[PDB]
Amino acid sequence: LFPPQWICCDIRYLDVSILGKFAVVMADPPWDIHMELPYGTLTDDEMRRLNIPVLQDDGFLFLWVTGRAMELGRECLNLWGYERVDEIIWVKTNQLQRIIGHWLNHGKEHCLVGVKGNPQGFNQGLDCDVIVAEVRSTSHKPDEIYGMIERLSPGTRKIELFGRPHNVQPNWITLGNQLDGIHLLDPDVVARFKQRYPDGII
Amino acid sequence: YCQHFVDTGHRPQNFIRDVELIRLKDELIAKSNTPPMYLQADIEAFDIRELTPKFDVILLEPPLEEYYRETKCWTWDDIMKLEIDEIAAPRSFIFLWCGSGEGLDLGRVCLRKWGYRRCEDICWIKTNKNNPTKTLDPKAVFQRTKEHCLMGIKGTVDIDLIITEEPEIGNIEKPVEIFHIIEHFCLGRRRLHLFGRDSTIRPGWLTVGPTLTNSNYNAETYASYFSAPNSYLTGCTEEIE
Ligand SMILES: CNc1cc(N2CCC3(CC2)CN(c2ccc(CN4CCC(C)(C)CC4)cc2)CC(=O)N3)ncn1
């Protein structure tokens, strides 16, 4: 079912095995990076424990990182069973195409790319590993990442973890704790959800 | 701009524009810089211990096989065995060129092997304004258009991007901008560039490399530049009179 679908929940406690297998996974986790907290983070062990491995047999994982999560994110990526094969960096500009941890000012954000199994029929090499785009809102990711992913694997099932309302996209299932309820349209998914959650509560 | 690159062959970085005066800092680095010293050495075969005293900054630019994907390469196997910890000051800095493939993981293993924490990921983005494609690594998912230079610290102004146009096929030079970033950090004056070439030799820097055609290195002459009262200068202050 091509149109947007989402699930409000806690990704820690949701049983993601009901969701099926996806050609692409994306996650922009709330890493417990440096001190303080504008939102609710997850501990390193909670990130290690996330049941990412069930979501894919063959395909690609996209994993935003920052600070020490560049190392941590590589550990989860490896533990969950992926090989890191690319790394996308987003160069943050303004509307006039000029450039906008403590040793160096940070002009970019990194997104690790991992592979699991042997994906086949993907248009590898279409885009390049750099993204240039205006910073729309703080803590948001650039919409271009969706276009790059669609061109790489057109028409396939994709799932985003730790999304927010603006992230909902056709061909995607968005999981996040700030979404409005449970909006699901794919029959096979609706079935397994009702089976696992007959009273509708994770 | 990612759709545009899919359309026209112009990498998104082609369209970045603009790519007070810290000119006083540039002059204080210049006055403080030691004479350029250089030594040709087969670093494979060379005891990295004869390189004394211990170094405040190390710039490490080993020749990766991927730099010749069009034209002695070093594997990450060979690099990881260099005894970098033996010649680093107890508080010191490394900048390691990692390319864009396995190096971004293996280079982090090296930094941890020699005792550093990664503090900065400096990214060299290459525009292709003068030739709007690339033959990809088998594992590659996207076209690779950047290289990473990892910065590590051990012990207790600028941006993390360098934008130049992609060099001519089989030109392996890294942007000279890397040296400005390092110098502007004022990390100390004992600076070593391993696998430099004749073309990278530079004031305030000791260059060691297999392809150097001349050497002038003398450990006692080198040590004299840092004997008291100059042992602790940042490289950014006035000379002691
Ligand atoms: C407790 N378990 C949860 C939690 C949860 N969510 C829902 C969505 C969520 C986090 C909690 C996103 N978040 C956030 C903020 C910043 C970053 C860092 N990133 C910013 C974008 C980038 C620069 C491109 C790359 C770096 C990542 C995530 C803020 C927010 O409010 N919500 N959903 C289900 N279970």
Say how far apart CA B35 and CA A19 lie, in whole Å: 65
The owner of tokens 């293996």 is: B106
Number of domains in chain B: 1
Measured from the Cβ of residue A198, the count of other Cβ atoms closer than 10 Å reads 8
In a domain, B204, yes or no: yes
The residue range of the domain holding B134 is: 22-224
Contact A32, A125 (CB under 8 A): no
Residue B74, both tokens = 């070093």
Q: Would residue B3 count as lying in a domain?
A: no
Could you tell me how many helices (H) and strands (E) chain A has, helices first?
Answer: 4, 9
- Give the integer Cα–Cα distance in Å for B16 and A98: 6
Q: Does B121 touch chain A (CB under 8 A)?
A: yes
Residues with Cβ within 8 Å of B99's Cβ and at least 6 positions away in sequence, in order, are B64, B66, B67, B147, B148
For ligand 1, atom 31, which residue shows the shortest CA distance?
A39
CA dihedral B38, B41, B46, B49 (to 10 degrees): 0
Structure resolution, Å: 2.7
Compute the half-sphere exposure of residue B187: CA atoms within 13 Å on the CB side of its CA: 31
Q: How far is B163 from chain A (nearest CA, A)?
A: 11
Q: Which of residues 116-135 of A touch B (CB under 8 A)?
A: 122, 124-133
Q: How far apart, in whole angstroms, are the C-alpha atoms of residue B172 and residue B67?
A: 6
Q: Which residues of A belong to the annotated binding site?
A: 10-11, 28, 141, 164-167, 177-178
Q: How far is B129 from B50, CA to CA, in rounded Å?
A: 45
For the Cβ of A39 lying below 6 angstroms from any atom of ligand 1, the answer is: yes
| Six token digits for residue B213 | 């055609």
Q: Could you tell me the end-to-end alpha-carbon distance of chain B, in angstroms, rounded to an integer? A: 55
Reduced to 3 states, what is the DSSP secondary structure of residue A36?
coil
The nearest alpha carbon in chain A to B153 belongs to A103
B136–A125 C-beta distance less than 8 A: yes
Please indicate, yes or no, if residue B230 is contained in any of the structural domains.
Answer: no
The tokens describing B70, both together, are 């069009």
Which residue is listed with tokens 């490394």? Answer: B94
Q: Where are the domains of chain A?
A: 1-202
Interval between CA A162 and ligand 1 midpoint (Å): 5
Q: Is residue B193 part of a domain?
A: yes
Contact B96, B109 (CB under 8 A): no
> Does residue B175 lie within any of the structural domains?
yes
In a domain, B232, yes or no: no
R_g of chain B computed on alpha carbons: 19
**For every residue of chain B, which 3-state class applies, written as one string?**
CHHHHHHHCCCHHHHCCCCCCCHHHHHHHHHHCCCCEEEECCCCCCCCCCCCCCEEEEEECCCCHHHHCCCCCCCHHHHCCCCHHHHEEEEEEEEEEEECCCHHHHHHHHHHHHCCEEEEEEEEEEECCCCCCCCCCCCCCCECCEEEEEEEEECCCCECEEEEECCCCCCCCCCCHHHHHHHHCCCCCCEEEECCCHHHCCCCCEEEECCCCCCCCCHHHHHHCCCCCCCCCCCCCCCCC
User: Quick check: is B17 in a domain?
Assistant: no
**Structure tokens that stand for A60 in this block:** 């690609």
Cβ–Cβ contact A201 with B under 8 A:
no
Q: State the distance from the centre of ligand 1 to the C-alpha of B166, rounded, in angstroms.
A: 35
Greatest Cα-to-Cα distance within chain A, rounded to the nearest angstrom: 53
User: Do the Cβ atoms of B200 and B212 come closer than 8 Å?
Assistant: no
Q: Which of helix, strand or coil describes residue A149?
A: helix
Min Cα distance A1 → chain B (Å) is 25
Residue A200: alpha-carbon gap to chain centroid: 24
Q: The domain spanning residue B128 has which CATH number?
A: 3.40.50
- Report the alpha-carbon distance of residue B188 to residue B56 in Å, rounded: 6
Report the alpha-carbon distance of residue A158 to residue A22 in Å, rounded: 5
Instruction: Put residue A65 in one of left, alpha, beta given phi > 0 → left and psi -120 to 50 → alpha.
Output: beta
B108 and chain A: CB distance < 8 Å anywhere?
yes
Strand order in the sheet with A83-93: A130-134, A83-93, A108-116, A59-65, A24-27, A158-161, A172-176, A5-8, A182-183
Tell me whether residues A115 and B141 touch, CB distance under 8 A: yes
Q: Please list every residue in chain B whose beta carbon sits closer than 8 Å to the beta carbon of residue A143.
A: none
Question: What does DSSP say about strands A83-93 and A130-134: parallel, antiparallel, or unpaired?
Answer: parallel
The reply to whether B9 falls in a domain is: no
Burial B143-167 (b: 16+ CB within 10 A, else e): bbbbbbbbbbbbeeebbbbbbeebe
Measure CA B68 to chain center.
18
With a 6 Å cutoff on the Cβ, whether A139 touches ligand 1 is yes
Which DSSP helix (H) or strand (E) runs through A193? Answer: helix A187-196
